[PDB]
């Protein structure tokens, strides 16, 4: 299909041409002629390499232009939002307002009412709906990217919830990877189903086993070692992407590869890779990233700061970096994609990476511009080669299961309905359930109903809600406030129960430990080695905490380690020193800090709700200290367009 055969305003055809696009891939055309341009819902299940995002932009803009209103683009993580924001800029050339909303859960954000295209994570949008933002009624279409994450135990329930709220109120467009139950999800969505595996560049998938790669077609190719695939790819001017399961693993493998890749890097690239390694902020975690990069290979994982990760990502794109070793969470295309591990550590033991995931990983092979073929190789270190092939190259992807039973999401969601959506009867809350994907999969209805009755009891006991002998459920201040803060009802419960202790002794350690013990935060882990030190410091500072005795406990000390880290953060300990002293990386530090700000904020708000107004100012000063990791006497110099503990501290001196 030629962009000009597209029955849409010239403004869109014009913007695409400027983009170099003149025609659509067969999968794109099928999607564009399925009814999405006429408002129908649709579920697009095709390779990422086939431009799922373009089908969404076109249907969004066409939607707005033909009927005013706004378009919502829901993104998986508040990090794939800035990239969606950059690529959605060219829509402003035709007068479209593109906004990005990610955090700050406690606000209606009425300022978004003047934008046409809004990008947000599922959580952020879920809370906007709770706050009842004025403009939401103007949303005419919502696009959910990687909609298949609805099957994620963690946050899939949130995505399901907002989708359940929006179905039949706006056009819904889902973008997903291949899954086992495409038609079931499409039906629940009352959507057109577009399933395809057509891709621009041919994809050859194989398995590397003891000196050889066996491709799906049947042929065999010798390779002395899996790493040789990388080396070969690099010698051939192409690049390589290698997936691993652990951070340190990614780090060991990156440094390793780089030790033999450097002898393939012309003077320019080595010269450049050095100007590159020297630009990295200084800290342990980067020192490593440094050595590897000067060698041409880099590692990529959550333990690295946002910037570092961006620097890697783009330079791999720029091609200045020949290969990047990365973990899954937070993972451009490459000629060769190597999956070096097929077993990952879960709390359920070491398990095999899901099929849906391996496919998504192999699908990143083959750059439209530079390749006549893309190759994805799974490395079988100690698995039956044939079994690996049959399970990951010829096995149906997993079927998506509603993750609505996730007790933490459900408890927070049952209250949200009562406290911000006016549900007042169990039977009415059940009506909501009936429109969810859980209800549509006809999954165990009884068990869900009982978990909800129990949850209502929990909420009724802790005074978030109230009931009548007529059984009319109505929310109370703490209920409404909790729901609007987006925190788990249980962390609110934990704040409420300890509010007397906090006002009796307001202090950093106590608070950080308290918040780091709730469900809304993932405390730092600790090893067998340091645990010794943690115990002494604990018993040395048990007076400042708000809990009697851990025993009378793993999370307790994780939270306690976290309380110490944050404490050093507010006391301006240099990043690098914190990384060292507590064995933690700047990625987790920024993540935890950012979450602590949110959580110390929510404690202030819950304090307001419970009369403890005398600690409000303190917690407020604590919130700001946590956000920038600074002493109070610097909070003024924080205003600036940008500075931080960085210069600020020096300035003040």
Author numbering: 1 to 331, 336 to 556, 564 to 664
What does the paper say about this structure?
Pyrococcus furiosus Hjm (PfuHjm) is a structure-specific DNA helicase that was originally identified by in vitro screening for Holliday junction migration activity. Previous biochemical and genetic analyses revealed that PfuHjm preferentially binds to fork-related Y-structured DNAs and unwinds their double-stranded regions, suggesting that this helicase is a functional counterpart of the bacterial RecQ helicase, which is essential for genome maintenance. PfuHjm folds into five domains (domains 1 to 5) with dimensions of approximately 70 × 50 × 30 Å.
We obtained the two different PfuHjm crystals (Forms 1 and 2) in the nucleotide free-state, and determined their structures at 2.4 Å (Form 1) and 2.0 Å (Form 2) resolutions, respectively. In the Form 1 crystal, the C-terminal 60 residues, about two thirds of the C-terminal domain, are missing in the final model, presumably because of structural disorder. The structures of the two apo-forms are quite similar, with a root-mean square deviation (rmsd) of 1.05 Å for the corresponding 651 Cα atoms. The Form1 crystals were obtained using ammonium sulfate as a precipitant, and it was found that five sulfate ions were bound to the protein. Notably, all of the sulfate ions lie on possible DNA binding surfaces. For instance, a sulfate ion is strongly bound to Arg306 and Arg309 in domain 2 of PfuHjm. Two point mutations (R306A or R309A) in PfuHjm significantly decreased the DNA binding ability (Fujikane and Ishino, unpublished data). However, the C-terminal segment was invisible in both the Form 1 and Form 2 crystals, suggesting that this segment is highly mobile.
